[PDB]
Design an enzyme around this catalytic site. Structure first.
Site, PDB file in Angstrom:
ATOM      1  N   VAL A  29       0.801  -1.241   0.000  1.00 31.68           N
ATOM      2  CA  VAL A  29       0.000   0.000   0.000  1.00 31.68           C
ATOM      3  C   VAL A  29       0.831   1.288   0.000  1.00 31.68           C
ATOM      4  O   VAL A  29       0.316   2.342  -0.378  1.00 31.68           O
ATOM      5  CB  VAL A  29      -1.025   0.053   1.171  1.00 31.68           C
ATOM      6  CG1 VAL A  29      -2.005  -1.101   1.061  1.00 31.68           C
ATOM      7  CG2 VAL A  29      -0.341   0.068   2.552  1.00 31.68           C
ATOM      8  N   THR A  33      10.754   6.487   2.100  1.00 30.26           N
ATOM      9  CA  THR A  33      12.066   6.419   2.752  1.00 30.26           C
ATOM     10  C   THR A  33      12.023   5.441   3.920  1.00 30.26           C
ATOM     11  O   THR A  33      12.964   4.675   4.123  1.00 30.26           O
ATOM     12  CB  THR A  33      12.520   7.797   3.270  1.00 30.26           C
ATOM     13  OG1 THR A  33      12.290   8.785   2.259  1.00 30.26           O
ATOM     14  CG2 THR A  33      14.002   7.782   3.627  1.00 30.26           C
ATOM     15  N   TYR A  34      10.934   5.503   4.688  1.00 34.03           N
ATOM     16  CA  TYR A  34      10.642   4.560   5.782  1.00 34.03           C
ATOM     17  C   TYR A  34      10.804   3.079   5.410  1.00 34.03           C
ATOM     18  O   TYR A  34      11.239   2.276   6.239  1.00 34.03           O
ATOM     19  CB  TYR A  34       9.225   4.806   6.328  1.00 34.03           C
ATOM     20  CG  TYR A  34       8.111   4.649   5.308  1.00 34.03           C
ATOM     21  CD1 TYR A  34       7.526   3.404   5.063  1.00 34.03           C
ATOM     22  CD2 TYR A  34       7.636   5.748   4.591  1.00 34.03           C
ATOM     23  CE1 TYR A  34       6.506   3.255   4.123  1.00 34.03           C
ATOM     24  CE2 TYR A  34       6.616   5.611   3.647  1.00 34.03           C
ATOM     25  CZ  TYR A  34       6.053   4.363   3.418  1.00 34.03           C
ATOM     26  OH  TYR A  34       5.045   4.225   2.491  1.00 34.03           O
ATOM     27  N   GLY A  35      10.445   2.736   4.171  1.00 34.67           N
ATOM     28  CA  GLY A  35      10.572   1.375   3.644  1.00 34.67           C
ATOM     29  C   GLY A  35       9.370   0.987   2.800  1.00 34.67           C
ATOM     30  O   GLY A  35       8.882   1.797   2.009  1.00 34.67           O
ATOM     31  N   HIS A  36       8.895  -0.245   2.983  1.00 33.34           N
ATOM     32  CA  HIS A  36       7.759  -0.804   2.241  1.00 33.34           C
ATOM     33  C   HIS A  36       6.681  -1.209   3.244  1.00 33.34           C
ATOM     34  O   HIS A  36       6.953  -2.020   4.133  1.00 33.34           O
ATOM     35  CB  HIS A  36       8.185  -2.056   1.446  1.00 33.34           C
ATOM     36  CG  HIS A  36       9.545  -1.963   0.822  1.00 33.34           C
ATOM     37  ND1 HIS A  36       9.735  -1.890  -0.542  1.00 33.34           N
ATOM     38  CD2 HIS A  36      10.783  -1.955   1.375  1.00 33.34           C
ATOM     39  CE1 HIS A  36      11.029  -1.825  -0.800  1.00 33.34           C
ATOM     40  NE2 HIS A  36      11.687  -1.859   0.345  1.00 33.34           N
ATOM     41  N   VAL A  37       5.475  -0.657   3.113  1.00 32.72           N
ATOM     42  CA  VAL A  37       4.353  -1.038   3.988  1.00 32.72           C
ATOM     43  C   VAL A  37       3.261  -1.799   3.210  1.00 32.72           C
ATOM     44  O   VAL A  37       2.925  -1.428   2.085  1.00 32.72           O
ATOM     45  CB  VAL A  37       3.776   0.174   4.783  1.00 32.72           C
ATOM     46  CG1 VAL A  37       3.183   1.240   3.863  1.00 32.72           C
ATOM     47  CG2 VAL A  37       2.747  -0.307   5.809  1.00 32.72           C
ATOM     48  N   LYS A  54       5.237  -3.400   7.970  1.00 28.13           N
ATOM     49  CA  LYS A  54       6.281  -2.490   7.484  1.00 28.13           C
ATOM     50  C   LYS A  54       7.666  -3.137   7.552  1.00 28.13           C
ATOM     51  O   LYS A  54       8.139  -3.468   8.641  1.00 28.13           O
ATOM     52  CB  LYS A  54       6.271  -1.223   8.343  1.00 28.13           C
ATOM     53  CG  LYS A  54       7.385  -0.199   8.058  1.00 28.13           C
ATOM     54  CD  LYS A  54       7.429   0.848   9.158  1.00 28.13           C
ATOM     55  CE  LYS A  54       8.598   1.783   8.992  1.00 28.13           C
ATOM     56  NZ  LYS A  54       8.571   2.866  10.008  1.00 28.13           N
ATOM     57  N   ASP A 149       7.333  16.365  12.945  1.00 25.93           N
ATOM     58  CA  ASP A 149       6.930  16.374  11.531  1.00 25.93           C
ATOM     59  C   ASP A 149       5.426  16.105  11.373  1.00 25.93           C
ATOM     60  O   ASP A 149       5.014  15.241  10.603  1.00 25.93           O
ATOM     61  CB  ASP A 149       7.762  15.348  10.736  1.00 25.93           C
ATOM     62  CG  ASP A 149       7.629  15.509   9.218  1.00 25.93           C
ATOM     63  OD1 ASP A 149       7.202  16.584   8.736  1.00 25.93           O
ATOM     64  OD2 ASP A 149       7.962  14.543   8.503  1.00 25.93           O
TER      65      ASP A 149
END
Ligand SMILES: Cn1cc(-c2ccc(-c3cncc(Cl)c3N3CCC4(CCNC4=O)CC3)cc2)cn1
EC number: 2.7.11.22
Lengths: 343, 266
Positions: A29, A33-37, A54, A149
């Site tokens: 979905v 930058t956080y990765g793949h969720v 995640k 943020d």
């Protein structure tokens, strides 16, 4: 080689693997930058509800990953996203995090209304949204945790299920080096004038921007696409007006104050105020909503209201009251999250 | 400081305050190879190693305590043979330093520190040099984070202690001695058995007794289980008698050979 074999193979046999416990292939979905969720479901169907799964970007345990896990593991509050589980994949050295799945967010919700106006229906949805956001940040601030943020993308709202229409705050700034910043639409003027440290006040300004955006369906300090930014400050003064010496006494102690004086003139923003701006978007300055907003969007950080004091505002005692379900039992018109197939 | 007032609903309080009998039951597997006295001497030794690692790396005392707690928590559950404590000590410091936002420890700096400390300060215990490269730390880090169930936030007696001596109004007279007694309590199991603030009161009491400061009324004015505090004081007083009788430098080579070692693969 180095380690005990029996210990090693015993843990390998017992270790829960994400691939075996959860179905998620082609359910991606989000990617950033956080990765793949992913929107995941349990293969051994006990719960039978959606989870946000995640995989963190990069290998190993970074400082950013280490602090995220550290804080989320302690934090528990209905208006903050809960880390349910952590899977460590030993071979590839990847780290997986499991959360409760949230179908919606303020970014999409506001975009849908802005889209609908060309091509907020429960009366106290904005107030309910605002109250739960404040309740969540109060919890973080009470535990000396800053978000750093805040923006509509990070304000999640739960879809159908037990927690129907509950706000869930996501994506806190978990690791900034030495607690320092050293779009810009939600960033407080002191950061734009080169403040060396994040503060509780910085998060509050962002809430004020989100509250303004909820009322009008447009970003209040909307702008074009290191610390200093002229056009963003130009926009803030276009809305708020230029701050008098009495309004913000410590402004002279900001590192970028001389640059501000070089580039700007009070006279330019003579016919500018938050009153006049909100009047143009059909919001009354007599309303309790406006007076609270003004207290949130104060130029001087030390004169900005706290989240505790914001929750005590008589706006939240005015009819209609805030509800736990922001949708107030109504049908949810907003679409579900689309899957990202392209890798 | 993050989560400062959250102790009573923390993962520390709710999962890592163990029962003394549960702790001693899991310890019986290592007591086949070592005596009770030798296990405690081994605990003192690796507490000093983590302190020496921390001082060399110029880390704050709070970071050294967190790493010490990570080390105790690990071997409270598992045997000494499971992972080599020479490998775990620097892994605990590495992970603990990453939990705090201020400062950074590089890979090369960690390996150099661990080598130097064991060479210079612990040559009586270790003839051969530190054999582990950085890949051994990174693999080990994953095992440590898993067994601790990602419980990284650790509460320590220092913050409570500061608040008590400030409340007494005698920081100059008491704080230096009480603070070092808190350091000493990490030679024992106390951090896995009692809440931080209880250990802080015990250390301050001992400091008052040592310096002949009459503080009976002040201690009476606190609403705490005083019987539990007297249990901690007896452990602290027993620690100093063990200190007296224990020559670390003469005994520790033999004790480390008596440790059960990790079996290789078949
Ligand atoms: C393309 N597009 C995807 C999204 C999106 C998808 C899913 C979610 C989401 C839903 N439920 C629980 C959690 Cl925890 C979620 N997060 C929030 C936090 C985050 C993003 C920023 N960093 C992270 O670690 C991962 C995703 C939030 C936003 C928005 N636009």
């Amino acid at each position: 080689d180095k380690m005990d074999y029996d210990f090693k193979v015993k843990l390998s046999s017992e270790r829960e693997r994400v691939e075996d416990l959860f179905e998620y292939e082609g359910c991606k979905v989000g990617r950033g930058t956080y990765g793949h969720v992913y929107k995941a479901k349990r293969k051994d169907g006990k719960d039978d509800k959606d989870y946000a799964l995640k995989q963190i970007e990069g290998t190993g345990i970074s400082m950013s990953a280490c602090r995220e896990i550290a804080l989320l593991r302690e934090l528990k509050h209905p208006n903050v996203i809960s880390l349910q589980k952590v899977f460590l994949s030993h071979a590839d050295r990847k780290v997986w995090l499991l959360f409760d799945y949230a179908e919606h967010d303020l970014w999409h919700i506001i975009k849908f209304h802005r889209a609908s106006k060309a091509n907020q229906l429960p009366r106290g949805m904005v107030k309910s949204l605002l109250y739960q956001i404040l309740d969540g940040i109060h919890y973080l601030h009470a535990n000396w945790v800053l978000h750093r943020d805040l923006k509509p993308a990070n304000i999640l709202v739960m879809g159908e299920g037990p927690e129907r229409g509950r706000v869930k705050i996501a994506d806190m700034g978990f690791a900034r080096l030495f607690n320092s910043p050293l779009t810009f639409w939600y960033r407080a003027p002191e950061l734009l004038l080169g403040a060396r440290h994040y503060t509780k006040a910085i998060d509050i300004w962002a809430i004020g921007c989100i509250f303004a955006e909820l009322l009008t369906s447009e970003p209040i300090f909307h702008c074009r696409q290191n610390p200093y930014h002229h056009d963003q400050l130009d926009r803030i003064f276009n809305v708020m007006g230029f701050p008098a010496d009495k309004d913000w006494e410590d402004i002279k102690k900001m590192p970028e104050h001389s640059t501000l004086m070089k580039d700007f003139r009070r006279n330019t923003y003579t016919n500018c105020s938050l009153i006049k701006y909100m009047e143009k978007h059909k919001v009354k300055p007599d309303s309790k909503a406006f007076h609270l907003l003004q207290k949130l969007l104060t130029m001087d950080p030390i004169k900005r209201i706290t989240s505790e004091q914001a929750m005590q505002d008589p706006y939240f005692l005015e009819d209609p009251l805030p509800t736990s379900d922001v949708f107030a039992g109504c049908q949810i018109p907003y679409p579900k999250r689309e899957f990202l197939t392209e890798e | 400081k993050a989560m400062a007032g959250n102790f009573w609903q923390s993962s520390h309080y709710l999962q890592w305050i163990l029962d003394k009998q549960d702790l001693l039951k899991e310890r019986q597997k290592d007591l086949k190879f070592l005596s009770e006295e030798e296990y405690w001497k081994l605990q003192i030794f690796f507490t000093n190693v983590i302190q020496a690692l921390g001082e060399h790396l110029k880390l704050r005392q709070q970071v050294i305590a967190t790493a010490t707690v990570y080390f105790k928590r690990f071997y409270a559950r598992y045997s000494l043979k499971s992972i080599d404590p020479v490998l775990m000590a620097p892994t605990c410091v590495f992970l603990a330093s990453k939990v705090e936002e201020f400062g950074v420890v590089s890979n090369t700096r960690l390996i150099a520190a661990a080598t130097s400390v064991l060479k210079t300060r612990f040559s009586y215990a270790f003839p051969k040099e530190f054999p582990y490269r950085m890949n051994h730390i990174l693999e080990c880090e994953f095992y440590l984070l898993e067994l601790m169930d990602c419980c990284l936030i650790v509460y320590h007696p220092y913050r409570p202690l500061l608040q008590y001596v400030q409340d007494m109004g005698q920081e100059d007279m008491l704080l230096p001695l009480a603070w070092r007694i808190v350091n000493d309590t990490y030679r024992t199991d106390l951090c896995l058995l009692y809440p931080p603030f209880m250990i802080a009161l015990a250390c301050l009491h001992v400091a008052c007794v040592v310096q002949q400061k009459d503080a009976r009324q002040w201690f009476a004015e606190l609403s705490v289980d005083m019987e539990k505090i007297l249990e901690i004081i007896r452990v602290i007083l027993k620690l100093y008698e063990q200190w007296k009788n224990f020559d670390e430098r003469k005994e520790m080579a033999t004790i480390l050979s008596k440790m059960p070692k990790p079996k290789p693969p078949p």
